[PDB]
Amino acid sequence: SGLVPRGSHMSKKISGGSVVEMQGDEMTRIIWELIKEKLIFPYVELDLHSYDLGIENRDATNDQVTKDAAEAIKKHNVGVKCATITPDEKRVEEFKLKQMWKSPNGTIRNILGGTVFREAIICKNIPRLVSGWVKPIIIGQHAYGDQYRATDFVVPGPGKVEITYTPSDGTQKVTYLVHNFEEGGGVAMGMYNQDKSIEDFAHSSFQMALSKGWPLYLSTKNTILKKYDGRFKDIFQEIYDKQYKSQFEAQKIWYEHRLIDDMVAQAMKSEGGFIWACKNYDGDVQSDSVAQGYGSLGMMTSVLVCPDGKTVEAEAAHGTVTRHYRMYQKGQETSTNPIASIFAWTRGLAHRAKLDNNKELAFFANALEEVSIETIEAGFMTKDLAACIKGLPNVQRSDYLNTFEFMDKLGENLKIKLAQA
Amino acid sequence: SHMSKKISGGSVVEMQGDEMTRIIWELIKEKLIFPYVELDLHSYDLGIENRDATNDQVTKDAAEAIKKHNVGVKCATITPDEKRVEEFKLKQMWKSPNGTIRNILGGTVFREAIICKNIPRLVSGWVKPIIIGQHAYGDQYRATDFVVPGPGKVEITYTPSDGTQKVTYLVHNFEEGGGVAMGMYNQDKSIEDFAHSSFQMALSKGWPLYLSTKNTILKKYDGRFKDIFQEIYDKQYKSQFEAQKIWYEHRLIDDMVAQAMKSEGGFIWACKNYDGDVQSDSVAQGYGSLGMMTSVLVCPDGKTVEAEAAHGTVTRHYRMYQKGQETSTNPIASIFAWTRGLAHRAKLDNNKELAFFANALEEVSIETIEAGFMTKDLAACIKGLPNVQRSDYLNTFEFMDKLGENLKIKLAQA
Numbered sequence: 001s002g003l004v005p006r007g008s009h010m011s012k013k014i015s016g017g018s019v020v021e022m023q024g025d026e027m028t029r030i031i032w033e034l035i036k037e038k039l040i041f042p043y044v045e046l047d048l049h050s051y052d053l054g055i056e057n058r059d060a061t062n063d064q065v066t067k068d069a070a071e072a073i074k075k076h077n078v079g080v081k082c083a084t085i086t087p088d089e090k091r092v093e094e095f096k097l098k099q100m101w102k103s104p105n106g107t108i109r110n111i112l113g114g115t116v117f118r119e120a121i122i123c124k125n126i127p128r129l130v131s132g133w134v135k136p137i138i139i140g141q142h143a144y145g146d147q148y149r150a151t152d153f154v155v156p157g158p159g160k161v162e163i164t165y166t167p168s169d170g171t172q173k174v175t176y177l178v179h180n181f182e183e184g185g186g187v188a189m190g191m192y193n194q195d196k197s198i199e200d201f202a203h204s205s206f207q208m209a210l211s212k213g214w215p216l217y218l219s220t221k222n223t224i225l226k227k228y229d230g231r232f233k234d235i236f237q238e239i240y241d242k243q244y245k246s247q248f249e250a251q252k253i254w255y256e257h258r259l260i261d262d263m264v265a266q267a268m269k270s271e272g273g274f275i276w277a278c279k280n281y282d283g284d285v286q287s288d289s290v291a292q293g294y295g296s297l298g299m300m301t302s303v304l305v306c307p308d309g310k311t312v313e314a315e316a317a318h319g320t321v322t323r324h325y326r327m328y329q330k331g332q333e334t335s336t337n338p339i340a341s342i343f344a345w346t347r348g349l350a351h352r353a354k355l356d357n358n359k360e361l362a363f364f365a366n367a368l369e370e371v372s373i374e375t376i377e378a379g380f381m382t383k384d385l386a387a388c389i390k391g392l393p394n395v396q397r398s399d400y401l402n403t404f405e406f407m408d409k410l411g412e413n414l415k416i417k418l419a420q421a
Numbered sequence: 422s423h424m425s426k427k428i429s430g431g432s433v434v435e436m437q438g439d440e441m442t443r444i445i446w447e448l449i450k451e452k453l454i455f456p457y458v459e460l461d462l463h464s465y466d467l468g469i470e471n472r473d474a475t476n477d478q479v480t481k482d483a484a485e486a487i488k489k490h491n492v493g494v495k496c497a498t499i500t501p502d503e504k505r506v507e508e509f510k511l512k513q514m515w516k517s518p519n520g521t522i523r524n525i526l527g528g529t530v531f532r533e534a535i536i537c538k539n540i541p542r543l544v545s546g547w548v549k550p551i552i553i554g555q556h557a558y559g560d561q562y563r564a565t566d567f568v569v570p571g572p573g574k575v576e577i578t579y580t581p582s583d584g585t586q587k588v589t590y591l592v593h594n595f596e597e598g599g600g601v602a603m604g605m606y607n608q609d610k611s612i613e614d615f616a617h618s619s620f621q622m623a624l625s626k627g628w629p630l631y632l633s634t635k636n637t638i639l640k641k642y643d644g645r646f647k648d649i650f651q652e653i654y655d656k657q658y659k660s661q662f663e664a665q666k667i668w669y670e671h672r673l674i675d676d677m678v679a680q681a682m683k684s685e686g687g688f689i690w691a692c693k694n695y696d697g698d699v700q701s702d703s704v705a706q707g708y709g710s711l712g713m714m715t716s717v718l719v720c721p722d723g724k725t726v727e728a729e730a731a732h733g734t735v736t737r738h739y740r741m742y743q744k745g746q747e748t749s750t751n752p753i754a755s756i757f758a759w760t761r762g763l764a765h766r767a768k769l770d771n772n773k774e775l776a777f778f779a780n781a782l783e784e785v786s787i788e789t790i791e792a793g794f795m796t797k798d799l800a801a802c803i804k805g806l807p808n809v810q811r812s813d814y815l816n817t818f819e820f821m822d823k824l825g826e827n828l829k830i831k832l833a834q835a
């Protein structure tokens with residue numbers, strides 16, 4: 001039967017190393033398991049550290065699992081996160097929650113720190129809503145502080161709201177009048193940010209612009225918040241003058257501070273092709289406008305780059321697609337776009353491979369991104385993208401693939417691509 | 422024999438401004454308003470020179486004058502920064518006149534694009550206008566902010582006036598370096614006025630109303646906006662809305678921004694102060710031209726209005742003008758400031774002729790531009806800035822003069 005041992009038909013899976021996975025809710029959870037089953041695990045073996053951030057396990061552990069996941073990301077340097085339920089009043093009723101738990105993304109970000117870089121996932125055949133955006137716009141959202149770690153409260157009636165700083169060294173405290181309510185009640189809030197966090201934010205922004213060869217703009221409202229936003233402006237400018245200016249000049253680019261009002265108009269009018277450093281809230285809100293302006297709200301990458309220069313968390317930024325989940329729970333067909341979740345996995349695994357000098361893993365991660373884009377541009381897509389192209393009322397069943405058909409088509413094309421290489 | 426009589430005008434609080442907008446303001450009065458309308462103008466000079474001279478008192482005096490006369494029109498003004506401070510040798514870096522007038526008067530700033538058929542939008546589907554109603558009081562614009570110079574505790578406290586024990590909310594314990602911190606507030610009555618003005622504007626335009634907040638994150642602060650609007654709607658407006666086949670909904674700011682991008686327009690968008698400030702720039706630009714916007718502060722008394730030009734004082738054109746070089750400065754926003762004010766004056770005085778005039782001036786502006794006579798910025802909207810030749814646009818004086826010729830023709834025909 002032949003003295004020479006013939007080669008195996010099954011080929012050796014890639015050693016991918018250590019990865020923290022944050023499991024999610026509803027249809028995104030369904031998608032997440034399909035991605036692992038059909039796209040990752042046949043080709044990559046992982047030392048996978050899985051945390052269930054589904055709403056029921058967050059409730060059971062009093063949100064401790066979210067903290068545990070963040071600490072694990074510190075330890076292993078790579079996290080990949082599925083979309084999760086951020087509960088409102090209805091979710092409190094539906095799950096009999098102990099509390100209207102806060103957004104886990106905010107908790108993870110306030111623990112890890114850094115900058116969330118957000119960018120559209122561009123398909124040649126998905127039309128833009130903004131005509132001129134022929135190059136990408138990359139938002140760098142400062143991931144720490146401000147509204148997302150504030151303390152807000154109802155003022156029940158007349159009285160003084162004051163804000164006080166008490167120096168740790170025992171020198172005199174300073175007290176500022178926020179407002180004397182003399183005619184009724186209202187609301188008040190305190191919020192803050194940290195110098196070191198702002199410095200990390202500036203560093204990540206300058207470095208991303210220099211890595212791309214694109215100009216950088218930071219938006220603030222320092223005309224109104226002269227101290228608070230002026231601190232962002234000053235720290236960026238001093239870091240630019242100290243370390244990065246000659247690097248920008250050598251690449252013929254620039255960094256400029258802009259008022260947020262001007263910056264959103266300028267962005268809308270632009271051709272794309274720049275980095276936009278945003279304070280936490282502005283990056284949160286403006287990335288929705290950028291995501292929708294490129295064609296599809298969900299076709300975004302979202303990667304938290306932590307201040308240590310080694311740790312990354314990639315996530316799907318859209319929601320858990322509740323209506324599709326309900327259909328799926330009744331055995332009905334859905335057409336759920338998995339691209340954002342797939343790219344969470346590929347961006348995470350690409351950083352894993354960079355940390356590990358894993359050439360096989362890096363080739364794989366890029367190959368999966370290529371397969372996803374090429375599949376869509378070849379005309380095989382989920383219903384939402386079909387509607388981007390034709391308009392929802394004109395979509396017919398042959399224009400799109402359902403959730404399982406689309407995953408299977410990606411799996412076929414990934415197998416072809418890895419075979420050809 | 423009867424003399425040629427100007428249209429009765431009434432009492433208008435004028436606030437004069439700075440730089441190129443001051444120049445075009447005088448041009449508008451001279452060529453478009455004064456030859457046809459006779460005004461009882463109460464003029465306040467909010468030029469940065471007089472604001473430094475009076476220690477910003479003139480701004481407050483103008484705001485009170487508006488309280489008195491119910492109709493105010495405002496030119497663009499310099500909001501000084503460090504550069505302005507050194508340039509004019511200012512005593513202080515005074516706050517923006519707008520912020521002061523708004524804190525004094527209260528109300529909601531309604532902003533909306535001025536649409537010309539030949540000016541292409543940047544957002545494909547916006548075939549109907551989007552009207553933003555920006556709450557004009559509180560939040561960031563009245564906040565107390567400071568630099569935290571080193572390790573220490575920041576807390577924000579509430580002390581009831583009636584003696585009941587205070588409550589202290591920890592903001593942050595800075596253990597390593599320093600940072601920044603800030604308190605801000607809003608008032609129930611001002612939010613209720615905001616809601617009432619939003620519901621009324623929606624009913625008058627016959628469009629649905631969305632309010633945006635971030636109450637996912639700010640459950641108490643933004644929760645109050647949401648709760649107040651929902652209660653005032655259920656109790657006082659839902660039936661009228663349903664009668665006009667419109668509706669009111671709360672939306673998260675993230676959702677609202679994306680859906681507006683993807684929508685057809687045709688709705689009222691109630692915004693917290695900061696969001697209205699920022700999103701209206703985004704909307705203005707998305708319709709084609711950032712400066713083609715009306716901006717009208719509607720005060721809670723339901724009678725007092727302040728119309729302004731929202732854009733800046735066009736400093737580069739002013740420098741050209743100073744050196745006797747021609748400029749192409751678009752005066753439409755300042756014109757519509759005047760016409761919106763005059764239309765409110767006509768409404769208050771039941772002045773048929775003045776209302777006819779204000780609408781006519783708006784029509785003449787739009788038709789002039791749509792007939793192909795425009796300033797350089799709109800030419801560039803059409804052809805793209807690199808492709809604009811001198812023959813594609815009119816300079817500031819030529820455009821003003823063409824508007825005057827067309828306004829004379831329009832008023833004569835009727």
Ligand SMILES: NC(=O)C1=CN([C@@H]2O[C@H](COP(=O)(O)OP(=O)(O)OC[C@H]3O[C@@H](n4cnc5c(N)ncnc54)[C@H](OP(=O)(O)O)[C@@H]3O)[C@@H](O)[C@H]2O)C=C[C@H]1[PH](CCC(=O)O)(CCC(=O)O)CCC(=O)O
Nearest residue numbers: 083084085086103105317318319320321322323336337675
């Ligand atoms: N990451 C996360 O963790 C998120 C969790 N959620 C949780 O998802 C749950 C529901 O969320 P909805 O908002 O109701 O939306 P949906 O996902 O149900 O989709 C609505 C309709 O659109 C269509 N459709 C959408 N995705 C599709 C897909 N893949 N394929 C195909 N069709 C798709 C489809 O339409 P048809 O039904 O007609 O086919 C579908 O029904 C609730 O529990 C939310 O809390 C929401 C968003 C983020 P996000 C954090 C962002 C950040 O951290 O930066 C804000 C997003 C933003 O800012 O833009 C939460 C806010 C916070 O945490 O503060």
Ligand SMILES: NC(=O)C1=CN([C@@H]2O[C@H](COP(=O)(O)OP(=O)(O)OC[C@H]3O[C@@H](n4cnc5c(N)ncnc54)[C@H](OP(=O)(O)O)[C@@H]3O)[C@@H](O)[C@H]2O)C=C[C@H]1[PH](CCC(=O)O)(CCC(=O)O)CCC(=O)O
Nearest residue numbers: 261497498499500517519731732733734735736737750751
């Ligand atoms: N309302 C006001 O009173 C404002 C006053 N200012 C004060 O104006 C001063 C300068 O301002 P810049 O920011 O440098 O801009 P610019 O006006 O000089 O134009 C820059 C370039 O664009 C082009 N161009 C613009 N307008 C054109 C026009 N008509 N025709 C033709 N081409 C035109 C042209 O381009 P070329 O040169 O290539 O031809 C030109 O050079 C500074 O001193 C500022 O303080 C700024 C804006 C508002 P704003 C209140 C908004 C609100 O309350 O609703 C925030 C802006 C926003 O939110 O949208 C600040 C005050 C506050 O904080 O309250």
Ligand SMILES: [Ca+2]
Nearest residue numbers: 284285288675
């Ligand atoms: Ca967002």
Ligand SMILES: [Ca+2]
Nearest residue numbers: 261698699702
């Ligand atoms: Ca603005």
Ligand SMILES: [Cl-]
Nearest residue numbers: 333334402403
């Ligand atoms: Cl299916």
Ligand SMILES: [Cl-]
Nearest residue numbers: 747748816818
């Ligand atoms: Cl001229």
